[PDB]
């Protein structure tokens, strides 16, 4: 099909752009709510081996505050991404001086490339995303409260205020869908804001581990 997969691509791009905005990167307002029509006009509306084919809709966006912090969001065509297909991405990453990228796979990316991916983590931090997940923004669901990522200074302020070691906080594991949405690694604390029926608003903190 052509219209259906075009719709899938448009939805995926919208979700990715919302993700980038919530991660603190500079995303313009118009590109954050562009409808299907302008997407078709800009990219082609004929992705059945036509103009709006993948690797043409990749996006590079810089941080809001520091212009030297950018991030790529690639779009492999092969349903099963292999070691070479990510080594080309790594080389493409190396020419510029940026270290963060996102991969949107279509099917289960191969485990050997997973090991290669995790091996190069300290130099270049980059992670994958199944295209099925990105069809919906989970942070919009009614069950999901507002997650906020803390800086080091406010985490230290919190620990000093409640006189508790960081070990004693509640936990959120690194594989959590919201944790992967926010790209948060081990050792970070997330502030969670909830509406409470007995107090009105309750703020709790989760530690990534």
């Amino acid at each position: 099909d052509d219209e259906e997969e075009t719709y899938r691509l448009w939805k995926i791009r919208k979700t990715i752009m919302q993700l980038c905005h919530d991660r603190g990167y500079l995303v313009t307002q118009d590109e954050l709510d562009q409808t299907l029509e302008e997407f078709k006009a800009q990219f082609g509306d004929k992705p059945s081996e036509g103009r709006p084919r993948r690797t043409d809709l990749t996006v590079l966006v810089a941080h809001n505050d520091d212009p030297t912090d950018q991030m790529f969001v690639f779009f492999p065509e092969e349903p099963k991404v292999g070691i070479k297909t990510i080594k080309v991405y790594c080389q493409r990453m190396q020419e510029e001086n940026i270290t963060r990228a996102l991969i949107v796979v279509q099917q289960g990316m191969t485990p050997s490339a997973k090991q290669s991916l995790v091996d190069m983590a300290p130099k270049y931090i980059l992670e994958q995303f199944l295209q099925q997940e990105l069809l919906i923004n989970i942070t919009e669901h009614e069950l999901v409260p507002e997650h906020v990522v803390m800086t080091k200074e406010e985490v230290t302020e919190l620990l000093a205020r409640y006189k508790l070691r960081e070990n004693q906080l509640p936990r959120i594991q690194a594989g959590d869908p919201v944790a992967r949405y926010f790209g948060i690694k081990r050792g970070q604390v997330v502030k969670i804001i909830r509406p409470s029926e007995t107090a009105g608003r309750y703020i709790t903190y989760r530690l990534v581990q």
Binding site: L26, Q42, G44, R51, P67, Q94, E95, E96, N97
Partner: protein
């Protein structure tokens, strides 16, 4: 003050004084004048006693009656202009305007005449010629009346337009010489729409109105100013006005402009900041859509392509497809899209050349550029890849062949492409490549490297290199090779260097900071801008 009342037979204060000067009894004469030829109703004269005896003088309700009957007449004439038959109501309003131009000289009734004249979509010739002779009558005219004035008055319309163009040029110059040097916001950062939504473009649209002739004359005036003063912002203003009018659904202006489709697709390209293969081939088909005998369309296309935004977008596209060719390892001769991008850049650059020569043709671009200059840039990029791989493998080459320097210092297209390649390697934050290509930057053909656009772009790209600006060798080489050869002569280069230093003075080494302070001291005969920048640097640094 009370002139023009005598024409209709209703005497004003002048004839009043003339008659009462040689009159012995003013009481009976004034009573009859306020009674006989006054309001011919028993109601008003019978109301005079009560209103007199109230203590409030009758002047008050007389003036109130005059003003409110004025307002009622104006509102009813407005309604009539939108009620009944169009031709009949227009003829009645024409009669009313003809009989009100006798009283047009009355400020208390000037609103009546002006509103009724606004009510007429097309004022006759003689009445317009009368009103435009007076400053306040001309200025109080409605938008339709001003449109009628400008439709057949070329010089006055140009005089009206000129200050707006002056404001546009002043804003553009202030933005180009902005102290705030960053990549987050620059001259080319804002979208084309908000620039078209800016006060200059929308105001020019309002003065143009819905007239094709006014829009064409504005384009011709911008073209003449751009040809004479050699300022390229007029082309940008023309393109912005055309696209704003098209987006305002002014189809009458869309069809009369032969470059409508090309300018629309180019506006799309500028909005996306990317001349993609689909849009590139669309623009190529537009370029091949020009017929023989109508080659002035080619000149208009070149002028449209002459915008700094359009030129920057086309050059960035050419450079990035050059890096794509290097990445896929394709020789320059095998890329036809590269040829199309070079042709578009050639048209954009030679807009002024072919307009001044009055030849409406594509200038010949030599094959030497493509065959020889581009492989040098690709060799530099391949050496970059080689150095990176060797860094990951178990010294960076900075030698510059004489051929590349010759082409850069002799070819304007090569000059622009090399300048933007230097910008692209600067945004990569690679000191070795900048030091390697600095000898090429030392001398450039056409002095494009010392232009305001490239000076601002280079300062913005170098702003990210504050850390590297802590090494005195790098800054000293970058200044003496490129900046110091023009800054004593060209004021713009000096201003840009001073602004970059102001933005990044903490990072400059103390010896290098002193050297830049004493070598770049303001000169007496230059502008006040350099003195202001140096004073600001001195105030902030200490």
């Amino acid at each position: 003050m009370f002139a023009g009342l005598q024409d209709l037979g209703v005497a004003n204060g002048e004839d009043l004084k003339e008659t009462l000067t040689n009159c012995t009894e003013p009481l009976k004469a004034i009573e009859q004048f306020q009674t006989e030829n006054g309001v011919l109703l028993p109601s008003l004269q019978s109301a005079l006693p009560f209103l007199d005896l109230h203590g409030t003088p009758r002047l008050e309700f007389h003036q109130s009656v005059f003003d409110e009957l004025r307002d009622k007449l104006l509102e009813r004439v407005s309604a009539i202009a939108s009620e009944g038959k169009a031709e009949e109501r227009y003829k009645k309003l024409e009669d009313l305007l003809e009989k009100s131009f006798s009283l047009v000289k009355m400020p208390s009734l000037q609103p009546v005449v002006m509103c009724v004249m606004k009510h007429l979509p097309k004022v006759p010739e003689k009445k317009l010629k009368l009103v435009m002779a007076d400053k306040e009558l001309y200025r109080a005219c409605a938008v339709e009346v001003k449109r009628q004035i400008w439709q057949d008055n070329q010089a006055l319309f140009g005089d009206e337009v000129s200050p707006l163009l002056k404001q546009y040029i002043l804003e553009k110059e202030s933005a180009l010489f902005s102290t705030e040097l960053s990549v987050l916001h620059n001259f080319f950062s804002p979208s084309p729409k908000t620039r078209r939504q800016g006060e200059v473009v929308q105001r020019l649209t309002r003065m143009v109105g819905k007239n094709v002739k006014l829009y064409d004359m504005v384009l011709q005036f911008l073209r003449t100013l751009f040809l004479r003063t050699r300022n390229v912002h007029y082309c940008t203003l023309r393109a912005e006005l055309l696209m704003s009018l098209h987006d305002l659904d002014v189809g009458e202006i869309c069809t009369v402009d032969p470059c409508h489709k090309f300018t629309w697709c180019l506006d799309a390209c500028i909005r996306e900041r990317f001349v993609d293969s689909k849009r590139a081939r669309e623009l190529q088909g537009f370029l091949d859509g020009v017929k023989k005998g109508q080659e002035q369309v080619l000149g208009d296309l070149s002028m449209i392509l002459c915008d700094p935004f359009a030129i920057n977008t086309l050059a960035l596209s050419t450079v990035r497809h050059l890096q794509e060719l290097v990445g896929q390892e394709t020789l320059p001769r095998d890329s036809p899209d590269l040829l199309l991008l070079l042709r578009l850049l050639a048209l954009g650059q030679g807009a002024w050349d072919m307009i001044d020569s009055q030849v409406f043709k594509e200038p010949k671009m030599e094959v030497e550029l493509i065959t020889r200059f581009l492989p040098m840039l690709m060799s530099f990029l391949v050496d970059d890849y080689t150095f990176n791989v060797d860094q990951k493998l178990p010294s960076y080459p900075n030698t510059l062949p004489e051929s590349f320097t010759k082409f850069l210092q002799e070819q304007r297209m090569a000059c622009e492409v090399g300048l933007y390649y230097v910008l692209h390697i600067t945004k990569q934050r690679n000191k070795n490549a900048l030091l390697r290509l600095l000898p090429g930057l030392v001398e450039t053909f056409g002095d494009l490297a010392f232009g305001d656009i490239f000076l601002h772009l280079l300062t913005g790209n170098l702003a990210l290199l504050a850390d590297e600006f802590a090494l005195e060798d790098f800054c000293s080489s970058l200044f003496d090779g490129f900046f110091l050869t023009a800054s004593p002569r060209k004021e713009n280069v000096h201003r840009h260097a001073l602004r970059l230093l102001i933005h990044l003075h903490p990072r400059v080494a103390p010896s290098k900071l002193e050297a830049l302070q004493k070598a770049l001291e303001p000169t007496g005969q230059s502008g006040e801008a350099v003195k202001e920048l140096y004073s600001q640097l001195g105030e902030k640094l200490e």
